[PDB]
Curated annotation (Swiss-Prot), chain A:
It comes from Saccharomyces cerevisiae (strain ATCC 204508 / S288c) (Baker's yeast). There is a cross-link at residue 59 (Glycyl lysine isopeptide (Lys-Gly) (interchain with G-Cter in ubiquitin)). The keyword Ubl conjugation applies. Pfam families: RNA_pol_N. The gene is RPB10. Component of the RNA polymerase I (Pol I), RNA polymerase II (Pol II) and RNA polymerase III (Pol III) complexes. Component of the RNA polymerase I (Pol I) complex consisting of 14 subunits: RPA135, RPA190, RPC40, RPA14, RPB5, RPO26, RPA43, RPB8, RPA12, RPB10, RPC19, RPC10, RPA49 and RPA34. The complex is composed of a horseshoe-shaped core containing ten subunits (RPA135, RPA190, RPB5, RPO26, RPB8, RPB10, RPC10, RPA12, RPC19 and RPC40) where RPA135 and RPA190 form the DNA-binding cleft. It is found in: Nucleus, Nucleolus. Keywords: DNA-directed RNA polymerase, Isopeptide bond, Metal-binding, Nucleus, Ribosome biogenesis, Transcription, Ubl conjugation, Zinc. Belongs to the archaeal Rpo10/eukaryotic RPB10 RNA polymerase subunit family. This is DNA-directed RNA polymerases I, II, and III subunit RPABC5. Zn(2+) binds at residues 7, 10, 45-46. GO terms for biological process: nucleolar large rRNA transcription by RNA polymerase I; ribosome biogenesis; RNA-templated transcription; termination of RNA polymerase I transcription; termination of RNA polymerase III transcription; transcription by RNA polymerase I; transcription by RNA polymerase II; transcription by RNA polymerase III.
Swiss-Prot record, chain B:
Belongs to the RNA polymerase beta chain family. This is DNA-directed RNA polymerase II subunit RPB2. It comes from the Eukaryota. The lineage of its organism: Eukaryota, Fungi, Dikarya, Ascomycota, Saccharomycotina. The binding of ribonucleoside triphosphate to the RNA polymerase II transcribing complex probably involves a two-step mechanism. The initial binding seems to occur at the entry (E) site and involves a magnesium ion coordinated by three conserved aspartate residues of the two largest RNA Pol II subunits. Present with 18700 molecules/cell in log phase SD medium. The gene is RPB2. It is found in: Nucleus. Component of the RNA polymerase II (Pol II) complex consisting of 12 subunits. Mg(2+) binds at residue 4. DNA-dependent RNA polymerase catalyzes the transcription of DNA into RNA using the four ribonucleoside triphosphates as substrates. Second largest component of RNA polymerases II which synthesizes mRNA precursors and many functional non-coding RNAs. Proposed to contribute to the polymerase catalytic activity and forms the polymerase active center together with the largest subunit. Pol II is the central component of the basal RNA polymerase II transcription machinery.
Swiss-Prot record, chain E:
Belongs to the TFIIB family. The lineage of its organism: Eukaryota, Fungi, Dikarya, Ascomycota, Saccharomycotina. Keywords: Metal-binding, Nucleus, Repeat, Transcription, Transcription regulation, Zinc, Zinc-finger. It is found in: Nucleus. This is Transcription initiation factor IIB. InterPro entries: Cyclin-like_dom (IPR013763), Cyclin-like_sf (IPR036915), TFIIB (IPR000812), TFIIB_CS (IPR023486), TFIIB_cyclin (IPR013150), Znf_TFIIB (IPR013137). Transmembrane segments: none annotated. It comes from Saccharomyces cerevisiae (strain ATCC 204508 / S288c). Pfam families: TFIIB, Zn_Ribbon_TF. Associates with TFIID-IIA (DA complex) to form TFIID-IIA-IIB (DAB-complex) which is then recognized by polymerase II. Sequence repeats lie at residues 104-180, 208-284.
From Swiss-Prot, chain F:
The C-terminal domain (CTD) serves as a platform for assembly of factors that regulate transcription initiation, elongation, termination and mRNA processing. The tandem 7 residues repeats in the C-terminal domain (CTD) can be highly phosphorylated. The phosphorylation activates Pol II. Phosphorylation occurs mainly at residues 'Ser-2' and 'Ser-5' of the heptapeptide repeat. The phosphorylated form of Pol II appears to carry, on average, one phosphate per repeat. The phosphorylation state is believed to result from the balanced action of site-specific CTD kinases and phosphatases, and a 'CTD code' that specifies the position of Pol II within the transcription cycle has been proposed. Component of the RNA polymerase II (Pol II) complex consisting of 12 subunits. Interacts with DEF1; the interaction is direct and serves to bridge RPB1 to the Elongin complex in a DNA-damaged dependent manner. Interacts with the Elongin subunit ELA1. Interacts with the Elongin subunit ELC1. Interacts with ASK10. Interacts with ESS1. Interacts with RTT103. Interacts with SHE2. It comes from the Eukaryota. The gene is RPO21. Belongs to the RNA polymerase beta' chain family. It is found in: Nucleus. This is DNA-directed RNA polymerase II subunit RPB1. The chain holds residues 225 to 280 of 1733 of the full protein.
Length: 69, 49, 45, 42, 308, 56, 49
């Protein structure tokens, strides 16, 4: 639903690189491989965590809140 | 892992690997048995229920 | 009385056992009960 | 003659609902089943 | 007047009466709460038929139908033999009345409870000396009218008369007779609440507005107007239908919906003169017949109401 | 068998009625009462038997 | 220590199925009996045998 905080295999913190990953892809016109290496994810266990992630939270946010303050 | 079994990583499980939700819904109605007997939603007391 | 919330217009209502289940503002017939205001503890594991 | 009683709307409504709510088609079985929603592929 | 045949489970050791008994459903045991002694073990939690004890009393019957293999000759004669039963004939009349009540209620798009109440009302008040010289049509309509009132979905006399062909004379007399029967049996063996009051004009407004297609905001305002409409003696004695319809018409012009008085009367079969005649009296109490929040907010202004 | 099985006894003249345990009455919500299928069949036999007695 | 053999190592897609042990484990020492046959009822959810 949202980017996992840590890598499952080794526990490296990858939850703080989602926005950076998206910025590299969009603004810098970098391919997925270069963006991951730029972010410092060398082990393919970390690469798949960010490469294969699906951001479903954005889809949920389209719905109006059930309770509004 | 013999005979179609497997070994999973506990650390990966702790971090949230293959961890899912589960929702169960319960339905109930205030049936009205004709014209006299009827039901209501209430917190019953041991002295009256 | 207890407080309920409309499922469409998000109106926060207060209903009694005699009041009919419906939104007095928009008329929607489904009301979501308000979340508890009492603290609930969770483990971060 | 009362047209409101000559034509009963429950015959069409009840028959279609019963045939769709249950599998029985008529008045074959298993024609209608509860849609699976466990996953999108299902 | 009969054998007791009653068993009370009490702990032989504790001897405290009445006892504290806990039913361990999962363990299927009845155990004393004080000492833990088990008083009864091996507790018990399609091979049956759905039976309704009240509307059908104690009547058990079975139908004869075709199977995987069957000759048509046998089915016809057996059905013919079954019909010619003297004892089952008496109950068939009540069932036949129930079937017609079901048809009338179903054709009216009424809820299931309304149909159930009508059937039950007929059964309770049938086979009585008072209601013997009254047409069966009036009996069914009165029960249906009674059933609607009980379920907070009360209808009008004209609404029910549209389906069941019965004049006002017999219907009103039958209803008064039917009401007395229920009231007599009620305390003797509840029945009515503030809903049973004849006027109850608040319940009709939501349905009348729906026919006109007005928004719920107009309907809510009409309810408030009708609620305060009973404080004026000059119109308090008017029929509930006129009170509700006139209140609806007043709010229609207040909110400026392009619906003329002719349409309001035509759809609800209320004379146009009555609508204008009633509106004139209500025009003198606009201050007390308009919601205060709505006027304060500014959605509706009293200046928008035409004056004569 | 003379003692136990005679040909005449294959024709039913008196019908034994099984006890309630064989045909228990179940309850779904305990405000509605349901009866076993055997109970209705026994009721049908009684209704038919009474009808025949009155007719004859 | 090194394993004398080399392991086929790489990522793979796996899916969690609906079958979980917590929804199948059940035991009964005693419990409710059927009204008709007076034998242990059927069903884990009803403390059956
Ligand atoms: Zn990693
Ligand atoms: Zn609302
Ligand atoms: Zn004890």
């Amino acid at each position: 639903m949202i980017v996992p905080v840590r890598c499952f295999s080794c526990g490296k913190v990858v939850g703080d690189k989602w926005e950076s990953y998206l910025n590299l892809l969009q603004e810098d016109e970098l391919d997925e491989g270069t963006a991951l290496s730029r972010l410092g994810l060398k082990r393919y266990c970390c690469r798949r965590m960010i490469l294969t992630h699906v951001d479903l939270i954005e889809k949920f946010l389209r719905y109006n809140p059930l309770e509004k303050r | 892992n013999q005979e179609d079994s497997m070994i999973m990583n506990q650390s990966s499980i702790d971090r949230g690997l293959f961890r899912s939700l589960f929702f169960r819904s319960y339905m109930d109605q205030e049936k009205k048995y004709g014209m006299s007997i009827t039901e209501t939603f209430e917190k019953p007391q041991r002295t009256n229920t | 009385t207890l407080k309920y919330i409309c499922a469409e217009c998000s109106s926060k209502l207060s209903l009694s056992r005699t009041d009919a289940v419906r939104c007095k503002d928009c008329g929607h017939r489904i009301l979501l009960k308000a979340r508890t205001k009492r603290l609930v503890q969770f483990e971060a594991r | 003659f009362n047209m409101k009683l000559a034509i009963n709307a429950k015959t069409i409504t009840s028959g279609l609902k019963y045939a769709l709510a249950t599998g029985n088609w008529g008045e074959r079985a298993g024609v209608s089943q509860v849609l699976n929603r466990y996953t999108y592929s299902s | 007047r009969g054998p007791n045949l009653n068993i009370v489970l009490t702990c032989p050791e504790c001897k405290v009466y009445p006892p504290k008994i806990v039913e361990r459903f999962s363990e299927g045991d009845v155990v004393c709460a004080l000492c833990g002694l088990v008083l009864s073990d091996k507790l018990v939690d399609r091979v049956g038929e759905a039976s309704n004890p009240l509307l059908d009393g104690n009547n058990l019957s079975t139908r004869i139908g075709k199977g995987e293999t069957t000759d048509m000759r046998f089915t016809k004669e057996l059905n013919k033999a079954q019909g010619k039963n003297v004892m089952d004939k008496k109950d068939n009349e009540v069932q036949a009345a129930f079937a017609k009540i079901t048809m009338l209620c179903d054709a009216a798009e009424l809820p299931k409870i309304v149909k159930d109440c009508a059937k039950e009302a007929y059964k309770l008040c049938h086979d009585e000396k008072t209601l013997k010289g009254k047409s069966m049509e009036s009996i069914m309509a009165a029960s249906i009218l009674i059933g609607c009132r009980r379920a907070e979905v009360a209808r009008t006399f004209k609404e029910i008369q549209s389906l069941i062909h019965v004049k006002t004379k017999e219907f009103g007399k039958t209803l008064n007779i039917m009401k007395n029967i229920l009231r007599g049996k009620s305390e003797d063996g509840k029945i009515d609440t503030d809903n049973m009051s004849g006027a109850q004009n608040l319940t009709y407004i939501p349905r009348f507005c729906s026919h006109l297609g007005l928004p719920m905001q107009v309907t809510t305002s009409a309810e408030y107007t009708a609620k305060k409409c009973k404080e004026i003696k000059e119109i308090a004695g008017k029929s509930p239908i006129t009170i509700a319809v006139v209140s609806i018409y007043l709010n229609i012009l207040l909110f400026q919906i392009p619906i003329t008085a002719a349409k309001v009367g035509q759809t609800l079969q209320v004379t146009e003169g009555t609508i204008k005649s009633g509106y004139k009296i209500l025009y003198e109490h606009r201050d007390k017949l308009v919601d205060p929040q709505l006027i304060a907010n500014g959605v509706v202004s009293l200046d928008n109401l035409p004056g004569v | 068998n003379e003692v136990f099985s005679r040909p005449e006894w294959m024709i039913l003249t008196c019908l034994p009625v099984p006890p309630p345990p064989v045909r228990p009455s179940i309850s779904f919500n305990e405000s509605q009462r349901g009866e076993d299928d055997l109970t209705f069949k026994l009721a049908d036999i009684l209704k038919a038997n009474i009808s025949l007695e009155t007719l004859e | 220590k090194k394993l004398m053999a080399q392991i086929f190592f790489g990522p793979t897609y796996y899916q969690r199925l609906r079958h979980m042990v917590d929804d199948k484990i059940h035991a009964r020492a005693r419990g409710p009996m059927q009204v008709l046959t007076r034998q242990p009822v059927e069903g884990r959810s009803r403390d059956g045998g």
